[PDB]
Ligand binder design. Structure first.
Ligand SMILES: *[C]/[C]=[C]/N1=C2[C]=C([C])C([C])=[C]C2=N([C][C]([O])[C]([O])[C]([O])[C]OP([O])(=O)OP([O])(=O)O[C][C]2O[C](N3[C]=NC4=C3N=[C]N=C4[N])[C]([O])[C]2[O])C2=C1C(=O)[N]C(=O)[N]2
Ligand SMILES: NC(=O)c1ccc[n+]([C@@H]2O[C@H](COP(=O)([O-])OP(=O)(O)OC[C@H]3O[C@@H](n4cnc5c(N)ncnc54)[C@H](O)[C@@H]3O)[C@@H](O)[C@H]2O)c1
Ligand SMILES: [Mg+2]
Lengths: 1212, 112, 56
């Protein structure tokens, strides 16, 4: 039996002093990074003057010397230019030239281009938009482009099509790539090699998602090395061409979490390529990628440079990124490695290509700081400082200064001085971008310094995959290439010395003013929770010890009544991934003590309600600080008790911290003396988010002034008991928060107890239906229904069309379906693939499936942990075998023998024929796949809605028409565009669904606290200037019937309604997070009086709903001669169960009438209904008798606006 | 400029639909598109699909896409003013069909 | 000013749209009110003309 966390994340090798100094700088404050870089980058006034003159001379040459001319000749708008290039791209996909010209002449030019050209013409329009406009739009307005294409063809005919085709052919065959194949690229390299340039070839491709794709990239590199080495023909590593590789192309799990696989499987592949480069004596450069791959790549560089089989060859090269805070320390490590190995490492200094992505990633992960600078000028100073370090070590490394910035170039040219020989150092540039600049550098007639051109190689399909990066770079106002073209910027501004500009700043190295540190994402509202960097060796080493120590603690959970801990039946709590690992002990609550706890809560309710809301919120904030400080220990418990990986557990604790701080702030924004608490609230929580949802419900209830009976899931009582301990330490009195461990009997006994004033339930729909039935008997002392928040299961779909990027889709599907072994309510259950791309994506998906590591979760390398119990395993497996028995194709990962000691289900893909093949939620790692024809998209959305669930939903598309269509027709609470559908963030994606998925209001949203008090407050930002027009028609109808008071109340409801609220919530860069209020659907009205009916109808119509009115009320004659607009919204129901599903209900009557109706409503099939009831007298006295908060439906939508490959907003 | 009802047939003078009325085949005006698809059009297309009216369902989907209903633009003009231009439904269209297929095509155009 | 703007606007809209498949109707009769005696007069005529129609 392995000791817990004994092998959590051991580093590849012991960290040397030089390696440790790299790690120490990972997220160093920007003000601390800059001063040493300023000093190292300082040059004499003579040199600065000479560099400025050289820079000015280069820039004057640049300014003194395609698509734009085409746009001009045919008077094209921007959209027409983009549409034309998309058409040209499509026509070039026709291989035969004569066939293409015939299609152009006879079919395209003469009329309908649409009739002749499963994939939108405009799939790559974001790229062409960058080419035409210099601006990035993350999605494509495909209806605008279609109109523009029709317009331009009808106006200009075949000549403009011919010119667009020839332009696209030149750009895609000669400008974006040096050649389509390595042979073609080598042929086209001779011209500039004869002038003194050299080449490094980049076999374009995506990062590997599968073993097969990594093997394909390997054979592509190997074949390119042969062609390059044959062409090099003994010219050597400086004069002759070389190759550049990206490590992520060569292994599908290139990450620190999979370090052992990287060293075991990726390293030999790089070695084999390096051995071939050695035999031909060409350069082989390792390109630099995301910041969390930097230090991992150093372990590969170390082993390769120490491997005697590669000795005698100085061609191994390595990129370092000057925008990274570790860059000078990385260079110290590399220079020392070069000395130790005796290999003259070729070091390519770049500024860095992932800037926007690094900012977004650090914010999402809640880390202390960025791993890159945030002011562009800091990167420039870093680059020059690092060049000074490299130029002092040319005996042991070969510096390669990759830049298109003439000021950067000039500064280094003069820094390097007058002594030069080929092999001392070189410059580098990108094909088709740097030739103008370096034609003023290479050659005895210029500066007589060599330049190596980085040459992309690949077909048109491969090039379009990630061309947005370079184009977005050259279009950013900070980019030299953009500024060199901007007439509004002078040469003086372009030759400004960044070293002296930074030195003279009032605070040297201050963070960019307009970029939020992750902790400050929400500004003054609240402090963001902090995460942990699992790529940081210091963090991993510290976490290893804290996690081990957490496994040595004697975790217990006891019935913590107001009077003290109670005795009960005690049993062990076992690790679901290894039942030999005893995590702790739980004493469960007798039904007698559960009922006693409710009585003690009722007795203590006045004392807790009298704690002012601000001080209740202070308790929540103190609990958040405690959980943040205790996160490492909490991680260890969650990992072992609940089957979570370290990443899952960090997200779990962060979410609890965010709940505490969000509900505290929402309290400070809203709660006053008139928002009286309900009374004792029973909080019943699921096993699968055993700290986050547990904490969220309890915190909300407590901060609203209610004492809480906390009933955690029987599977996960320990982390629950620890959360209660933290809340009590933070100042929640024992009488206000009682913990009652146990199974559903304890939950049921709490729900049924006389003094229970409200219930907050998260769990299965079936259990919620049992609680709904138990509460249907019950009324408050005021004679009103006991409020129930019931947040339940999902049957969550993702729709993928042929414009989506397969690698992006597969990553988001793998994460959404199999993270936490599918044991998220948000998990992806049904993937819907457009038929034209289904086979390719499915093959990639199955390949990615088999790269997952399943096992006990106290190892960083484990991706997918166990299912929670043997019963859950049996239920999931029964479903899989039923599907297999029907002949459906089933793909499963093989499980390791070690899983036998726990309860594991392998990640599984099941190919279905129809969405109706699924019956109920299968809460496990089981992804179902269905295919659809594009014309059937609307019917597919119907099919998704038809399950009756409505929790999470994903859409992958680049096409605005498809976004608008799908998002307007889908009925789900949490929408996600071009991203995964999991990990909703508190106050950013307020979380919760509709139908069988929930009553609402959403947890982590602004309507939540208002449900836990007798009179709901007005939430922040909660209003709408829009008035429902059917409500307005009804108010006029009422005035025509003489019902003057009801017409006034109807108009007031129309104004009070927040239907149409449409907000963007603050969050991370690279994402737009939207929150909107919609109609719920059809509301069941059960009136008793005419005026009651009018008030009910006004409330329902003002919030956008239709209604079904109880025909047994006998009030038909009160609604004669309705306007057709109102009649369209009104039906009469004799059999309520036949006319559903409803989305809520309004009831009028005395207490016993309300009780009877509530029993009838609870018996309706399908979704739990949020019921509001009032007496006739209450309707007359209280305009808010029916609260409009609960008659609208919240919808959250999260759009990944970086999905096109970059962040347009941050480029400015 | 131009109105509806007793005030005009349209298209508006000084607007982008105007010239297209004065030729036998109207062009696609500048900026004339919409990403929104009428939901009743979508339901009509599915109904046509179920009946096997394949040409008509295709015509309906094409009308749904090329319709500029929902266009909502800000036009360039002076500072201190916002000048908006939007395309709404006309209202109720009189349909005078002769054949079943003609009626389906008329319905597609009107619903879209 | 309005007459000038009609002229230049329909000129530009023509440059943005009209090609060989956008055939003219033929003779167009332009009947105008007294109250905008140059602006609407010019606008209707200019549009019909630039669309390729002779005007009465
Ligand atoms: C595959 C890969 C590749 N590589 C390379 C190579 C070569 C030869 C070259 C030339 C390049 C490359 N890359 C890219 C780089 O990095 C960059 O990006 C470019 O180059 C640009 O730079 P330049 O020319 O220098 O320009 P400028 O303009 O001067 O600059 C720009 C830059 O900056 C920065 N930023 C911006 N913004 C900002 C910044 N920072 C801070 N803050 C702020 N706000 C950035 O960086 C930009 O970019 C590459 C490579 C590799 O390998 N890796 C990488 O990463 N990259
Ligand atoms: N909508 C959401 O936000 C959300 C979030 C997480 C999980 N869920 C759902 O939760 C389910 C998985 O969690 P689970 O397995 O712990 O759910 P569950 O329904 O099996 O149990 C949830 C809680 O109800 C209690 N319970 C069982 N019977 C009860 C009864 N008769 N009366 C009162 N309480 C009773 C349990 O002890 C537990 O504390 C999934 O269906 C998942 O989709 C929903
Ligand atoms: Mg259960």
């Amino acid at each position: 039996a392995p000791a817990p966390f004994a092998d959590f994340a051991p580093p590849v090798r012991p960290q040397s002093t030089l390696r440790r100094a790299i790690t120490a700088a990972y997220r160093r404050p920007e003000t601390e990074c800059l001063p040493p870089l300023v000093e190292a980058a300082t040059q004499s006034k003579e040199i600065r003057d000479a560099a400025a003159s050289t820079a000015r001379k280069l820039i004057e040459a640049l300014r003194g010397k395609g698509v734009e001319g085409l746009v001009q000749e045919y008077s094209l708008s921007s959209q027409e230019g983009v549409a034309l290039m998309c058409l040209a791209e499509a026509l070039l996909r026709i291989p035969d030239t004569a066939t293409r010209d015939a299609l152009i002449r006879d079919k395209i030019a003469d009329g309908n281009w649409k009739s002749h050209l499963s994939r939108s013409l405009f799939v790559n329009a974001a790229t062409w938009g960058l080419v035409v406009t210099g601006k990035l739009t993350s999605t494509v307005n495909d209806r605008s482009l279609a109109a523009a294409l029709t317009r331009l063809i009808s106006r200009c005919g075949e000549p403009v099509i011919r010119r667009g085709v020839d332009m696209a052919m030149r750009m895609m065959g000669e400008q974006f790539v040096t050649g389509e194949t390595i042979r073609e690229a080598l042929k086209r390299s001779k011209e500039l090699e004869e002038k003194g340039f050299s080449y490094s070839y980049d076999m374009l491709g995506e990062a590997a998602t599968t073993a097969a794709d990594a093997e394909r990239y390997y054979r592509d590199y190997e074949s390119a090395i042969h062609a390059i080495g044959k062409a090099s023909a003994g010219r050597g590593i400086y004069e002759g061409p070389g190759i550049s590789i990206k490590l992520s192309a060569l292994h599908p799990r290139y990450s620190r979490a999979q370090a052992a696989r990287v060293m075991g499987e990726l390293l030999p592949r790089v070695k084999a390529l390096a051995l071939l480069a050695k035999n031909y004596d060409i350069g082989l450069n390792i390109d630099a990628e995301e910041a969390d791959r930097l230090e991992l790549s150093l372990d590969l560089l170390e082993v390769l440079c120490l491997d005697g089989d590669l000795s005698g060859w100085n061609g191994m090269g390595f990129v370092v990124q000057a925008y990274g805070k570790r860059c000078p320390f990385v260079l110290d490590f590399i220079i020392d490695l070069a000395r130790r190995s005796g290999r003259r490492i070729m070091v390519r200094l770049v500024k860095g290509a992932y800037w926007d992505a690094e900012i977004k990633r650090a914010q999402l992960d809640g880390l202390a700081d960025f791993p890159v600078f945030t002011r562009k000028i800091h990167t420039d100073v870093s680059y020059i400082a690092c060049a000074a370090k490299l130029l002092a070590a040319t005996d042991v490394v070969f510096p390669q200064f990759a830049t298109h910035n003439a000021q950067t170039l000039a500064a280094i040219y003069h820094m390097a001085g007058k002594d030069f020989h080929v092999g001392k150092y070189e410059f580098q540039c990108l094909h088709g971008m740097g030739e103008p600049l370096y034609e003023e550098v290479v050659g005895r007639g210029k500066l007589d310094r060599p330049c190596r051109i980085y040459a992309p190689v690949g077909t048109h399909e491969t090039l379009l995959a990630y061309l947005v990066r370079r184009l977005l770079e050259n279009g950013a106002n900070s980019s030299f290439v953009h500024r060199i073209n901007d007439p509004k910027v002078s040469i003086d501004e372009l030759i400004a010395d960044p070293v002296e500009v930074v030195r003279a700043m009032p605070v040297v190295g201050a963070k960019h003013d307009r970029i939020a540190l992750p902790a400050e994402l929400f500004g003054d509202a609240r402090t963001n929770s902090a995460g942990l960097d699992l790529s940081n060796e210091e963090t991993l080493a510290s976490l290893t010890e804290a996690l081990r120590e957490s496994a040595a603690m004697k975790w217990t959970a006891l019935p913590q009544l107001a009077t003290g801990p109670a005795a009960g039946e005690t049993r062990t709590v076992l690790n679901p991934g290894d039942h030999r690992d005893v995590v702790g002990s739980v004493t469960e609550t007798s039904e007698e003590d559960a009922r006693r706890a409710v009585r003690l809560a009722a007795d203590a309710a006045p004392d807790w309600a009298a704690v002012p809301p601000s001080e209740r919120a202070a308790c929540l904030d103190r609990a958040a600080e405690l959980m943040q400080a205790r996160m490492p220990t909490l991680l260890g418990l969650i990992i072992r008790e609940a089957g979570k990986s370290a990443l899952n557990a960090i997200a779990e604790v962060r979410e609890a911290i965010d709940f505490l701080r969000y509900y505290a702030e929402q309290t400070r924004r809203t709660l006053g003396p008139g928002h009286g608490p309900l009374g004792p609230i029973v909080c019943i929580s699921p096993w699968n988010f055993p700290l986050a949802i547990f904490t969220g419900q309890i915190a909300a209830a407590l901060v609203a002034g209610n004492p809480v009976l906390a009933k955690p899931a029987e599977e996960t009582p320990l982390i629950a008991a620890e959360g209660v301990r933290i809340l009590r330490e933070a100042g929640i009195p024992a009488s206000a928060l009682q913990l009652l461990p146990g199974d559903g009997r304890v939950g049921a006994a709490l729900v049924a107890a006389a003094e229970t004033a409200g219930v907050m339930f998260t769990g299965s729909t079936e259990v919620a239906r049992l609680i709904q039935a138990q509460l249907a008997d019950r009324l408050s002392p005021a004679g009103r229904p006991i409020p129930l928040i019931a947040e339940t299961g999902g049957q969550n779909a993702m729709i993928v069309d042929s414009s989506a990027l397969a690698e992006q889709v597969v990553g988001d599907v793998i994460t959404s379906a199999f993270d936490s072994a599918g044991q998220r309510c948000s998990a992806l259950r049904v993937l819907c693939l457009q038929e034209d791309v289904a086979d390719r994506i499915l093959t990639m998906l199955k390949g990615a499936l088999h790269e997952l590591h399943i096992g006990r979760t106290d190892r960083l390398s484990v991706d997918v942990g166990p299912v929670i119990t043997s019963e859950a395993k049996d239920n999931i497996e029964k479903h899989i075998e039923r599907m297999r028995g029907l002949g459906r194709k089933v793909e499963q990962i093989g499980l390791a023998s070690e899983t036998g000691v726990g309860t594991f289900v392998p990640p599984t893909i099941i190919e279905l024929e129809k969405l109706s093949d699924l019956q109920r939620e299968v809460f496990g790692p089981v992804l179902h796949v269905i295919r659809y024809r594009r014309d059937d998209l609307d019917r597919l959305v119907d099919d998704v809605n038809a399950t009756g669930y409505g929790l999470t939903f994903g859409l992958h598309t680049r096409l605005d028409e498809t976004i608008a269509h799908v998002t307007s027709r889908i009925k789900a609470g949490n929408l996600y565009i071009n991203r995964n559908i999991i990990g909703a963030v508190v106050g950013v994606q307020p979380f919760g669904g509709r139908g069988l998925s929930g009553t609402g209001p959403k947890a982590g949203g602004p309507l939540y606290l208002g449900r836990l008090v007798t009179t709901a407050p007005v939430p922040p930002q909660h209003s709408s200037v829009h008035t429902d027009p059917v409500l307005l028609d009804f108010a006029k109808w009422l005035d025509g019937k003489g019902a003057r008071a009801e017409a006034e109340a109807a108009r007031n409801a129309g104004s009070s309604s927040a239907l149409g609220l449409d907000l963007e919530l603050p969050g991370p860069v690279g994402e737009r997070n939207l929150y909107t209020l919609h109609a719920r659907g059809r509301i069941l009205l059960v009136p008793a009086t005419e005026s009651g009916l009018y008030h009910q109808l006004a409330a329902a119509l003002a919030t956008g709903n239709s209604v079904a009115i109880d025909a047994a009320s006998g009030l038909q004659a009160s609604l004669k001669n309705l306007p057709q607009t109102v009649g369209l919204r009104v039906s009469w129901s004799k059999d309520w169960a036949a006319d559903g599903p409803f989305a809520g209900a309004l009831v009028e009557g005395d207490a016993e009438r309300i009780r009877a109706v509530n029993k009838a409503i609870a018996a309706l099939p399908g979704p739990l209904l949020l019921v509001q009831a009032a007496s006739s007298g209450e309707i007359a006295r209280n305009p808010d008798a029916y609260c409009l908060n609960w008659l609208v439906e919240e919808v959250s939508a999260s759009i990944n606006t970086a999905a096109a490959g970059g962040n347009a907003s941050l480029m400015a």
